């Protein structure tokens, strides 16, 4: 049912009025929005911005520090163990004691070393024993700590502690001396870091990756420095616990050459806590910043550098712990990109220098460098294009002050690189190589950008920036509304109003005539496809229940109810769905929910920490946005073949028309019949016209929806969409408590931001839909207005044969303007222009020279007739350029660079247990391999991730939790949940999946017991049976050891757990499909809250409650066994005992046989495929996305266990064809019988970026992956 919803009345809009206005507009001189690049222009822009920056910020003489941990290495480094730690600590304390301190930091250092050296044997035994053997003593209260009362502490040392317990300036960038000093320092550091210290996939890896990358980087100083920093950060993390952060600690590494002194600090579990330490090292080559060192104590024929008290937060610590892996993966990505670019391996010096630069970037995680690289990502294309917004970007480069010497060196390198690029083979950024294609340079800068953790973003400065941006645009909207009236701003102005004012053409101010004409131009195309438009609109299923869909019960994040304190509650979508279902009496449809929540105001907030991009909104706002998005996505999919890319063929189709039109030549007629030969040229603009802008007006869409012609017979749905757009007009923006407290704890901008809120917890914002999902609506509007500009231009110059073709993919948009230039370069064209301008065609003044400039000016103005503004910065216009088109097509093709997923895998883990996070790490590297990563790079990433996971859980050989110590089976043949080699290969993981090791093992084990009846095969079967027993004990693959999960929600305990288990057992069908009714959907959603895999996702960013909460237990009692919390060693021993006495049974054999039978012959293909190399140079092709692959599978399974009328009706409703369901079962069971009982059925139960040659078959994808195994040499399968 659709209610009457007023609707809108059509107005009389004539294209001739717009054409006349365009004539009047073009009759005068207009300025261009972009500046020509010349090299000199970029250099003067840099100089002027340098002078302005020097004037703006106060000048400082002493640069700040940038090395969080300073250390030096002369010899090779071996990982630190307990006995090595003992010997190192003793030697280091002796070395410190023989010295003479100078400053309070040195006095504290000497005092702590002297206190450590005088500990008794009992304390030393307890200082290094694990928790099991640990005993509290007088001087040692926690495993790796000791106390320090005031008595041993000196007066000065205490001074440091009291100073610890108890304006903005920048460097002189314009000065040549500061730049020279910073460049010299960073060059010294980098040169020290580069100094040397003194299956078939395996074959290809050892031939290429292990030889030219890992063998080269194995001997460098940066490799061992990264390992040393990993050890130091591991020791710091071990000290960040709740019970250990209160006391001091001392550690040593590298034969007594590096020492770490940990001071008392607030535990990192509570947010905003900094672990404080002092690092003391013998001064030598490496991460040494002598100026920023606290002291340099003198020793005979030696120097000992003592750093200042370094405070490192949580995310910085976690980033430093994985800095070496991030640097290695970035270097591997650069290695792959170099091989792609040039076809030859990088030499020694190039690889060493790029690895040193990546390591230095990964060590120093600073906001300034992250912003600098983010800006450079767009600065590079803007400098290679004929015209662009480069000054706006160069001005953005100086937003923040330059504090450390690292920022000055990076800025100097960027300035040199940009000036070299604009003068124009493209120079590199951290080496002496010139790339053949600048896409390699863009990828290099992108890899550098992704080396910075996505936790740096946010802070309290970024949230303030986005808040002030929103408030500034809201205040601008209020000013415009009071200046022109409420009605004119909301409903838009008319053509004659704009003609009279000649100013209303601005942002947050649209023209009704423009909207109507754009809708008419869209309807021109839309009329021929009315039937399919109506079918697609009706196919959105507006009648199905709202909360039974997956998008409405996800973890997206929505605003809750307003509280008594007046602040909006951030919460989860599923929680709000549960709340509504509990308060409601049914499960309403989309339109019914909109009817119920039409009167409620739209409230909005900002996500706490997950943050500028997510304006979380309440349920009614989401419902209205979903109505509008469903309608506009339904009507917009039909013209996706030509204008709205979702796709590549549309962009290819537009370019083909442009090139063909340019190939043909044109003649213009004359009154004297003297045809004039015109040369056709093309100009390409890469504009981000359709991004969401804070300054905008949603109300325009109303009129658009009023005139957009669908095939529906009634106007009920159109009026409903218009009413939803009307209700999403006004919103109640809410202050975040963090920002409120930060501001409460004087600036005029802050003052005016405060007056924007009457009550200090909320203020009204109008016309800004606050980043809500209206992407399809915005893209459709942009396409319609581009078509309107095309029509206006064709009406403006009928005699001229100009060309305009546009494509809109996501936020980016490509405009191609085909213009006419004189061939003879004579005055005949200007003579004709003069004749036309004298004949009354005054608008021909702007066509005299540079027709494409006037074309773009008119296009930008026509877009401005709405709220669309082509961003001055970030738009780049170039002639017909193969590289430009190639990078545009690549950015349209490679949606996400694989290096983002690669670095992300080491940065975050689920922490649900060894198997779970190992699977997640292996899955992320597989997804990156899908995204375009070379198999060798993905194999390297897999190795690094698996090694990190093994280090975390002590599974690697020669560690406490090694399965081979007790399980009497080889580490390779051990099941994955108990520690299992868990390495395999990237090909096996990508093709088969992320669990094949267990089945292959089980399968062979079954065979090993079926034919030879060997004892070890029976042992493996016993281990598998033990895992199945543990899984049976655990409540909702073969079997998983349960690991402790640390917690918490409003409705998470609405029903008892035993009732949930009983309901899940009784209503089996709801496990496979979602229950439509409210009384059962409520219980299903409550069950979804208690799922362990979801709680870890809601709190995955919790400050330590997840990040180090379980990186602390590691070797404690965290596993579940026999209803007890026990150590992993105890679980391994229990598994060994169970498997030793396990006796084979017929039922277990049947279960194992069924599981093996259930688990495409992907492994068999990889064994049977043959690959032989050919001596032929590799060729790089365009990147293209492919897919790797009657009733739905769950519906038939859901139908199988249907026992009541409600369940059977629900499985009808969710199924596409509810009639065929029985037939499916009727055959499916027979198939099972040829391969029934409930339990057997219960246990029975990808976009890939490739080259253009690859087909859409999964075998073709696997063959391509096999071909891409060699970075230089081609392969034949």
Numbering used by the authors: 226 to 391, 401 to 432, 449 to 674, 700 to 885, 891 to 926, 931 to 1029, 1033 to 1323, 1332 to 1342, ...
What does the paper say about this structure?
Hantaviruses are causing life-threatening zoonotic infections in humans. Their tripartite negative-stranded RNA genome is replicated by the multi-functional viral RNA-dependent RNA-polymerase. In this context, we have focused our interest on the replication of the tri-partite negative-stranded RNA genome of hantaviruses. This essential step of the viral cycle is performed by a monomeric 246 kDa viral enzyme: the polymerase, also called L. As for other segmented negative-stranded RNA viruses (sNSV), the replication of hantavirus genome is done de novo by the polymerase, in the absence of any primer. HTNV-LD97A core consists of a central region containing the canonical palm, finger and thumb domains of RNA-dependent RNA-polymerases (RdRp) that together form the central cavity containing the active site.
Cryo-EM image analysis led to the determination an HTNV-LD97A apo structure at 3.3 Å resolution, revealing the organization of the polymerase core that is globally conserved compared to the one of other sNSV polymerases determined as far. The flexibility of both the N-terminal ENDO domain and the C-terminal region precluded their structural characterization. A different loop called “priming loop” (residues 1322–1334), based on the naming from the Influenza polymerase, is short and disordered in the apo conformation. In the apo conformation, a positively charged pocket is present between the vRBL, the finger, and the core lobe in a conformation suitable to bind the 5′vRNA end. A positively charged groove is also present at the polymerase surface between the vRBL and the thumb-ring, suggesting that it might correspond to the 3′vRNA secondary binding site. In the apo conformation, the groove entrance is closed by two elements that we call the upper and the lower jaw. The apo structure adopts an inactive conformation that involves substantial folding rearrangement of polymerase motifs. A global comparison reveals that the motif E adopts an unusual α-helical configuration in the apo map and switches to the canonical β-hairpin strand structure upon 5′vRNA binding. The observed folding of motif E as an α-helix has a significant impact in the relative position of the thumb and the palm, which induces a differential placement of canonical motifs and inactivity of the polymerase. Of particular significance is the conformation of HTNV-L in its apo form, that had, to our knowledge, never been observed for any viral RdRp.
